[PDB]
């Protein structure tokens, strides 16, 4: 069990830096990887930029503009910091943490189940 | 006196004046839930008048002051059911009579 | 009549359950007919539990069948009334009527919360229960007479609600099991008709609440010999082989940059070359392998005489094209074969991590829902191992098989290490009048389904207790083991098949009885061919037949031989009469039937001796309870549940109402009687006090915490609750208290209670000492003096019936024509009863 308490985000307009401090506080067991999802309102949940232990950074579609995230599993502090923004990017941005080793799962669908999500934060753009 | 309470609604109209005719299905109880008399049994409504006080006062009052298709419960107190001297063989001498009525066919 | 029928939704919560608690369903009445036979046509609406909700048509308790709502474990509304407990208790409403065609019942459960609320025609019941037993399961269950047509409306897939849930209640349709599928079923049954003919069934199965749990074994701690290095090492390789292997033939790639979508392995290097995270959770799994099967019986052995070199490794067949590749396979499944003992150890070793995984699963936060639901925290799969379907059940041993396969391969020399029971036993046995004592006669029984089946002949005394083939009054045959019983079993033939038939044959006239199977004679170890023989008629024998929990069988006596099977190919030149066969009209049997009842103490009883002694000195009529075989041989303990023969009535209107004084005699309405508790019985096992006439609990573990109690609490339109009545079917105070209250004293223990019938209160006292317990109850209700407990001496209790100063003895209140006597004299009706199990039907 894992409390993953995530602050930040706050209402900005375009080009405005905002950052986003979360905090994955438990068992220091299992921590390799972190990944981030946002739910847009009434909206498709996108994946976010995720990194993976070992500073292995994953990216996708929604990384588009400026995202830049400073996680470390050492204090389970992430940081993801945005300094562009653009009005599709008005989303409730979450923060799982998981056991998954470099995104990859030999044994399975069990391992797989092993997510812990947090409270998340909501984005907004003007 | 008689205590009504309303089982399912019944025509609200057609109350039962004097002078009037009443046949009647109901199911005659004790106050401990003792049955002594059940007109469904013998599967014909009894039919009395208003105003020959021909049935006991509680019951021609809840006859009077309820509507046809509807079914109501009546309780009856001591003092308007037959009292001290009551019914040989059914009722004792101090009871609290619970009847299931149900008035259609007012004439 | 009535008949019940329920949603087959079943849902309960426990300390650690899967299941959610609110849950919302509706119900639609189409078509009723206004009165039945000139009788207002039944028809309630309501939630019941899995156990101790058991409606009979005909011949249920109080006056008519329970259906719903006339017990503690189910509750109900009808338009007008709330039901439960047998009792009716009228809630007020916007709409006041019984159900008529056309109308919508709203019904919604919280398991979280005792409580239970109703919503006739979008008017709320303003009256709810409250702090009822949330044990066990609750269905949705609806009760009616003839003429009536009513349709569920469970939402989503069955059914759909007329207005919408109250904020936090799920439908009901998705608590759905996944092996079953969705249906209307009786709650319980003992018999079942098919194109056959009448097929008696068994008791129903359910789950319990504490099923659903998870209960590893915990493997981290343990320490492992110095295989970690040596041969775990060999184990990691051979497992990334066989991933690599199953990943070259599925589309994942080795890129050397990670990516999912363009299916690139992270490594790809041949060798794993895993990082020290990678690298330690590959070896740490085989490392937990290792440390459950050295926790289990298993020993690992790493001597294999240098198997690994004669292990063919050159197993690559050149489809890899990528950077990582090259897996070869050690033909270890040629090698060395799977034992059933290694294949079991398997299915032990998935169960265990899957086992933890739910514990993990459920600690986290999640609960069994019908589909997956990832916010809500929700997964078909996070039950237990056992209780998941087959398709999780192969997904999660595949490994552990291949796993198995390179220890073998690798040579670890590992190997692998009452309430109910009459509950689980149906009997059905023909009625003592049909017992025949002349002639050769004949039966059939059909095994629909094969196991815990006895059939035979037994006398007509049957002690509905005592199963078939113990006592000497049957010479049944359980041909499901294939051995005959009688006092012990027999072996004898052979077990039977599905669907085959079972021809018992008795001969009155030569005393004998054969147990035939399929028309093929069932024989013995020396030859003999009658199953039974040299019998001594007596009283005669019945086509007897005893079924297991939901077992299936066709009884066929033999009413008309063209239906009767096999009769020709044995039987009918053996000069064998079919049973009652000239008869018109089917014969009437009796079964066994499961509902506790209070039975008179039996003077020869083995263990329980009951005195009676009245007019001694200083103590009024007593009736003495004394332990028979304690300090001997062949002494057992068990709980013992005792009454009363006679209640005490209260009355219809609570208007509240040394040398003793006149006037308080003739004055007051409240009554005495007192328990002794003799030396050597320890006051812990003891109980005194009261039950209703609706108590039926027969718990060998009976605990003051395990009482029955519901609170009927009715409202206004607004919510404010004006009513609170609790309701219960026992007031028995525990000896503990008095006992902690103060070795072996010589001095008994005397606990008195006080009864007032005219205010409604009954009270407890214990060696002069007041007890804080106090009860109150409702007009119109008559109680039985009971007792609880658990013999632990030679002599136990002593119940005497007397009076105090300016008290009367319960004999006033036990007689209306001796109300105003104020002597104490225990009525000769009185006697003493006990609870038993089982009863005849």
Request: a neutral charge; proline letters at 7%; aromatic letters at 10%.
């Amino acid at each position: 069990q894992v409390q993953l308490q995530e602050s930040g985000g706050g209402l900005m307009q375009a080009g405005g830096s905002l950052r986003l401090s979360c905090t994955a506080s438990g068992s220091i067991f299992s921590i390799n990887s972190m990944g981030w999802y946002r739910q847009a309102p009434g909206k498709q949940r996108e994946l976010v930029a995720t990194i993976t232990s070992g500073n292995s950074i994953n990216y996708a579609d929604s990384v588009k503009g400026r995202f830049t995230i400073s996680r470390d599993n050492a204090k389970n502090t992430v940081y993801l910091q945005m300094n562009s923004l653009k009005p599709e990017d008005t989303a409730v941005y979450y923060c799982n943490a998981d056991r998954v080793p470099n995104g990859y799962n030999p044994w399975g669908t069990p391992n797989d189940e092993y997510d812990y999500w947090g409270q998340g934060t909501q984005v907004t753009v003007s | 006196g008689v205590e009504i309470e309303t089982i399912s609604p019944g025509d609200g109209r057609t109350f039962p004046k004097k002078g009037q005719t009443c046949v009647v299905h109901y199911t005659g109880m004790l106050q401990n839930g003792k049955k002594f008399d059940s007109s469904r049994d013998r599967n014909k409504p009894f039919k009395f008048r208003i105003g020959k006080q021909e049935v006991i006062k509680g019951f021609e009052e809840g006859a009077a002051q309820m509507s046809l298709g509807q079914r109501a419960k009546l309780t009856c107190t001591p003092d308007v059911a037959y009292g001290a001297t009551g019914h040989p063989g059914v009722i004792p001498p101090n009871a609290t009579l619970i009847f299931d009525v149900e008035l259609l066919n007012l004439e | 009549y009535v008949t019940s029928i329920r949603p087959n939704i079943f849902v309960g919560r426990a300390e650690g359950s899967t299941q959610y608690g609110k849950w919302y369903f509706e119900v639609m009445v189409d078509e009723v007919v206004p009165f039945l036979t000139a009788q207002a046509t039944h028809l309630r609406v309501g939630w019941a539990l899995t156990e101790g909700y058991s409606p009979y048509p005909g011949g249920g308790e109080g006056w008519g069948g329970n259906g719903v709502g006339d017990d503690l474990y189910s509750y109900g509304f009808d338009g007008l009334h709330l039901w439960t407990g047998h009792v009716a208790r009228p809630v007020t409403s916007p709409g006041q009527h019984l159900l008529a065609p056309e109308d919508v019942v709203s019904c919604c459960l919280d398991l979280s919360v005792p409580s239970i609320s109703f919503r006739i025609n979008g008017c709320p019941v303003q009256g709810v229960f409250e702090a009822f037993n949330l044990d066990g399961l609750f269905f949705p269950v609806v009760s009616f007479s003839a003429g009536v047509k009513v349709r569920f409306l469970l939402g989503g897939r069955h059914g759909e609600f007329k207005f919408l849930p109250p904020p936090g209640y799920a439908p009901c349709h998705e608590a759905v099991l996944p092996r079953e599928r969705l249906r209307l079923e009786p709650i319980k049954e003992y018999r079942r008709e098919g194109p056959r003919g009448p097929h008696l069934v068994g008791p129903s199965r359910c789950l319990s609440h504490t099923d659903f749990v998870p209960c590893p074994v915990d493997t981290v701690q343990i320490v492992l010999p110095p295989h970690l290095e040596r041969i775990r090492e060999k184990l990691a390789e051979n497992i990334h082989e066989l991933w690599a292997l199953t990943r070259i033939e599925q589309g994942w790639t080795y890129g050397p940059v990670r990516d999912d979508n363009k299916r690139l392995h992270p490594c790809l290097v041949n060798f794993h070359s895993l990082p020290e995270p990678e690298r330690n959770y590959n070896l740490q799994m085989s490392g937990e392998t290792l440390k459950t099967l050295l926790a289990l019986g298993c020993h690992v052995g790493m001597a294999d005489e240098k198997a690994e070199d004669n292990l063919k490794k050159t197993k690559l067949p050149k489809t890899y094209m990528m950077s990582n590749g090259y897996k070869p396979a050690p033909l270890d499944l040629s090698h060395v074969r799977l034992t059933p003992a290694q294949t079991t150890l398997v299915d032990r070793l998935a169960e265990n991590g899957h086992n933890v995984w739910a514990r993990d699963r459920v600690a986290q936060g999640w609960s069994y829902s019908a589909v997956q639901d990832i916010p809500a925290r929700r997964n078909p799969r996070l039950v237990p191992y056992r209780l998941l379907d087959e398709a999780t059940k192969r997904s999660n041993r595949d490994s552990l098989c291949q796993a198995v396969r390179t220890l073998l391969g690798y040579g670890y020399n590992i190997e692998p290490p009452n309430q109910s029971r009459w509950d689980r036993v149906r009997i059905f046995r023909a009625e003592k009048s049909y017992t025949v004592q002349s002639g050769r006669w004949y039966f059939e029984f059909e095994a629909v389904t094969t196991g815990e089946m006895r059939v035979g002949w037994a006398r007509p005394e049957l002690r509905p207790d005592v199963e078939l083939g113990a006592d000497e009054l049957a010479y049944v045959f359980n041909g499901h083991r294939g051995q005959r019983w009688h006092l012990g079993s027999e072996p004898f033939g052979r077990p039977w098949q599905s669907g085959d038939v079972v021809g018992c044959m008795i001969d009155l006239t030569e005393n004998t009885i054969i147990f035939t199977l399929n028309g093929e004679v069932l024989m013995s170890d020396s030859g003999s061919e009658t199953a039974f023989r040299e019998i001594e008629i007596g009283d005669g024998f019945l086509p007897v037949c005893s079924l297991g929990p939901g077992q299936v069988g066709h009884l066929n006596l033999g009413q008309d031989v063209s239906s009767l099977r096999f009769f020709a190919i044995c039987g009918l030149q053996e000069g064998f009469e079919p049973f009652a066969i000239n008869m018109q009209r089917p014969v009437t049997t009796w079964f066994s039937k499961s509902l506790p009842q209070f039975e008179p103490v039996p003077p020869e009883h083995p263990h329980y001796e009951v005195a009676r002694m009245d007019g001694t000195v200083d103590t009024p009529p007593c009736l003495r309870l004394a332990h028979r075989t304690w300090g001997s041989q062949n002494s057992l303990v068990e709980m013992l549940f005792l009454r009363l023969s006679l209640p005490v009535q209260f009355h219809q209107h609570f208007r509240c109402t040394n040398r003793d004084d006149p006037e308080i005699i003739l004055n007051t309405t409240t009554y005495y009687y007192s328990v002794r508790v003799f030396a050597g019985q320890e006051p812990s096992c003891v109980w005194v006090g009261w039950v209703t006439p609706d108590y039926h609990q027969h718990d060998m573990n009976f605990d003051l915490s395990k009482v029955r109690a519901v609170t009927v609490t009715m409202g206004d339109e607004q919510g404010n609750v004006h009513s609170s009545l609790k309701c219960s079917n026992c007031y028995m105070v525990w000896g503990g208290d008095f006992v902690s209250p103060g070795r072996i004293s010589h001095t008994d223990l005397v606990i008195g209670c006080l009864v007032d019938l005219a205010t409604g209160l009954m009270t407890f006292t214990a060696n002069g000492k007041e007890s804080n317990t106090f009860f109150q109850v409702e007009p119109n209700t008559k109680l039985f003096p009971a007792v609880f407990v658990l013999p632990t001496h030679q002599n136990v209790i002593q119940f005497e019936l007397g009076k105090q100063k300016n008290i009367m003895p319960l004999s006033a209140a036990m007689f209306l024509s001796e109300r105003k006597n104020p002597a104490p004299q225990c009525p000769p009706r009185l006697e003493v009863q006990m609870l038993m199990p089982v009863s005849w039907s």
